[PDB]
Design a protein around this ligand. Structure first.
Ligand SMILES: NC(=O)c1ccc[n+]([C@@H]2O[C@H](COP(=O)([O-])OP(=O)(O)OC[C@H]3O[C@@H](n4cnc5c(N)ncnc54)[C@H](O)[C@@H]3O)[C@@H](O)[C@H]2O)c1
Ligand SMILES: NC(=O)c1ccc[n+]([C@@H]2O[C@H](COP(=O)([O-])OP(=O)(O)OC[C@H]3O[C@@H](n4cnc5c(N)ncnc54)[C@H](O)[C@@H]3O)[C@@H](O)[C@H]2O)c1
Ligand SMILES: NC(=O)c1ccc[n+]([C@@H]2O[C@H](COP(=O)([O-])OP(=O)(O)OC[C@H]3O[C@@H](n4cnc5c(N)ncnc54)[C@H](O)[C@@H]3O)[C@@H](O)[C@H]2O)c1
Ligand SMILES: NC(=O)c1ccc[n+]([C@@H]2O[C@H](COP(=O)([O-])OP(=O)(O)OC[C@H]3O[C@@H](n4cnc5c(N)ncnc54)[C@H](O)[C@@H]3O)[C@@H](O)[C@H]2O)c1
Lengths: 249, 249, 249, 248
């Protein structure tokens, strides 16, 4: 069978985009996948891959406790957690409202911390565990009018290193991916509703050495690698999956 | 006469350690300094340097608004903000309590964002403005059992870049210092608590290429430089003031 | 027939350590492997894996040209180059002799550049190409008395980004691995001949979050991943394979 | 006077950032020895009360001669600035091996060698400082500039290596990573383009400050890192890039 045959894999934000691609890639490799999402259409992603769906608002700490408990019971084991779910609140420090800023911090930074602790408790039971955080090139650099996302992804990058150090004694590896521009529905919607879609997309493509957008499946492959025993000496690493975005200007 | 003659400078956490050294260094260079702190001894630091003291819980958004308003009124202008105030909550993701984690994020990451926005509104009035964030080597690396501090200083590093980008059009430069081990009362307390204080201190010294602890005044000099017109082409920089700590293992 | 079935793979320094493990991992995945080395025992590594061996001093530009020409002819195609071969010259700037410093730069930095150009010309012919540079944690940080190695691995890291940008139009991805302490014969010899072998090894292990040395095979897996189409949106990346060495102090 | 009576060696001092560095040190009371291939360096030395040495930093004998003669002329060495650098246009595919090796020799081997030579002179008085002028292109790549990218990359990690190895000699070693600075070198490149104002605007737009740097702004960062105000700063790479490397 496959790389994750009979392993329990938790994927946050699995209803679409990179999270859906991650849930599919794990299920292709024989994993029992529990995905959560705020969007109820995540039910169909779980049905199609033979996994479990949990409708969960990751802003709420009680719902995060419930998700890991119920996922663990449904799968019978937890081997991998992927912290994929994330939101943004448009605006500079000047423009963003404090409640919106705090919600971005809660979902993007506090939830991955909390879920990593909850999942880590389930990961001691069988053999070794792995966590992969989906960061962004915007955890390592800033862009205009995106303070909450930049700050939270920055925190997630150093939280990845913190978890790597603190969970090594439990035989858990913790790594992150930093995607470049990935052609998820979220990004294609933003492009589509731009004044000049073709020009916007061309300009985004041109920021990458590969001169194209990434596919969600390409981020999934990097997550699968970092979650697998092929990455047995990799922990605390931030892997750019950005087509060379962060290698030049 | 001096580098900040007649400039208004806001310093958070000015009651002792690096914040006190920063407030003194600005006053030596002719600044009108408004420092805030929870600790009442901040009153004496202000009296000694000819500045204003505000007793302020930076956890509370109303108190942050009050501090910048009252500081601005007392000084007659705001030219510089230093986000120096910070806390830690001992523990891994496994051990730290969610409310303590959120308070570290509020003080260490949300407060600098909020104060930067409030201060930036006061800085348009005169000539150019500068913000300096006191981060840490633990914004760029993790250590054991310090998840909240690691995550919040990580966020502060990328928030520095975000503010740099968003405030550049307002002629406001935003930089950070990443100190190594600095001989503040906070660090001497930690050392004093160990079974063999001198051995603990020696072990900390040995992590630095300079084989000593930093002085608070040495961090103050880097902050003064980054706040000054000598750093007119420096924005979005994280300057290590760590005696070579982060240059090797 | 495997991940590299029928692909031509060039591996420098393949006679032992990480290079040998890389040559084996590619051959296990069905590659035609041409490895080169200064050591004639590399003949046996090639015989054992069904590959070709070329005895080559990579210091000499004529021998680098000969290696790629002869490898290309023997394999019938070039799909992957691994720049694994490297030397050190003990000493600070104060202690290292200029000719020894220049030889380290020639083997560790100039050779990978030159081989990448030669290999890239062969990689146009069939489908896409990949280059993986074996850097080190000492390309991103320094250690005492190792200036030539630190400088050359530093250069190799930015050369990896340069090649990523310049070879993207030829459909060639270029990435690096930055290994931590890997238990190759070279490292075990250094430990073995140390005043207190067990203490030396323990101290090296303790620098890693995983509290052990890496295996050459663990570096090989990361190289295979970066060389493969699973890493199709990964170029210009430096991937630590260091058991969390660079994530903390 | 921050460097009153200090001996300061500046490579590539004939123009651009090197000239601005030599002027800034002299303004702060330093005895400045600058070297350059360009003879106009003589005028920069005369104007600031310093010494000029015409020196091809590619040649190891000329590097030994420069530090010896500078040391004798100044009476002491307190600071070295490795500012001199060259580029060789081309990718790995396009650059010629000899041009690649010359860029490595001038940009990476010369700073190493000069740092060792200068360090030997710095033990004599109190503490010493070295500042390397790197680039944003030591931390990132751009198209068709492999030799410059590779050499500035090496210079960044050499800065850390020297920081560790020279800390015991009480020598601090730091680097600046400038963004686009309006030196004659950059204004020449701009001037050559079909639409110089558009080329300059495009360069400006890469910086959060939406302007080119002044050579004097790099000089101020070098003065700071060379000074006792930076007494706890060693092995640091300080971007002086108007926020260039903070975003894309
Ligand atoms: N697409 C890109 O270009 C790109 C670039 C870099 C990083 N990222 C990161 O990749 C991840 C996936 O993004 P995407 O492009 O697939 O976008 P997306 O908006 O489709 O996000 C994936 C899912 O997260 C879910 N989610 C959000 N908040 C949630 C909550 N409170 N509770 C439960 N689920 C919640 C959404 O419902 C959605 O299904 C995110 O971490 C994002 O920041 C994306
Ligand atoms: N000392 C070190 O070794 C070291 C290392 C690197 C980074 N740092 C950073 O440098 C800064 C100064 O640290 P320090 O060593 O002087 O320690 P410190 O504990 O003395 O902190 C500075 C001040 O912040 C104040 N403060 C904290 N929370 C506050 C709040 N809610 N409202 C108002 N005031 C508040 C404290 O009262 C204190 O006087 C911090 O940001 C710290 O994280 C310190
Ligand atoms: N082992 C570690 O702990 C470690 C740490 C990080 C980086 N690295 C890097 O990993 C790579 C593999 O090193 P290793 O530990 O296997 O050591 P190693 O010394 O066994 O090196 C591998 C091979 O390089 C060959 N080589 C050297 N110079 C050559 C030349 N001029 N021409 C041809 N072949 C030449 C040697 O003969 C040897 O077979 C190197 O780039 C090394 O710097 C190793
Ligand atoms: N101008 C920019 O935007 C920019 C960007 C990043 C960093 N830098 C770096 O700053 C430094 C100075 O750049 P600049 O713009 O002033 O350019 P520049 O070309 O004017 O160079 C400085 C001096 O170095 C001298 N020099 C070169 N090779 C020499 C040799 N072999 N021997 C002796 N002297 C030699 C030149 O004659 C010149 O006077 C370099 O290290 C450069 O790469 C500049």
């Amino acid at each position: 069978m496959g790389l994750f045959a009979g392993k329990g894999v938790l994927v946050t934000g699995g209803a679409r985009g990179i999270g859906r691609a991650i849930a599919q890639a794990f299920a292709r490799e024989g994993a029992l996948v529990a995905l959560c999402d705020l969007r109820p259409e995540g039910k169909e992603v779980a049905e199609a891959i033979g996994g479990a769906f949990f409708q969960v608002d990751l802003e709420d700490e009680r719902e995060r406790v419930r998700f890991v408990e119920e996922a663990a019971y449904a799968l019978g084991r937890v081997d991998v957690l992927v912290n994929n779910a994330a939101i943004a609140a448009p605006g500079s420090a000047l423009t963003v409202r404090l409640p919106e800023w705090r919600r971005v911090l809660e979902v993007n930074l506090t939830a991955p911390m909390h879920l990593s602790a909850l999942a880590a408790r389930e990961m001691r039971k069988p053999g070794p565990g792995a966590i992969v955080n989906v960061a962004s090139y915007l955890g390592l650099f800033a862009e205009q009018e995106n303070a909450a996302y930049n700050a939270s992804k920055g925190g997630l990058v150093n939280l990845t290193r913190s978890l790597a150090l603190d969970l090594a004694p439990l035989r858990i590896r913790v790594n992150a991916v930093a995607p470049g521009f990935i052609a998820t529905e979220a990004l294609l919607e933003l492009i589509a509703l731009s004044p000049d879609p073709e020009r916007t997309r061309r300009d985004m493509e041109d920021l990458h050495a590969l001169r194209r957008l990434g596919k969600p499946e390409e981020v999934a492959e990097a997550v699968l690698f970092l979650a697998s025993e092929k990455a047995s000496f990799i922990t605390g690493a931030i892997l750019p999956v950005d087509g060379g975005l962060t290698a030049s200007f």
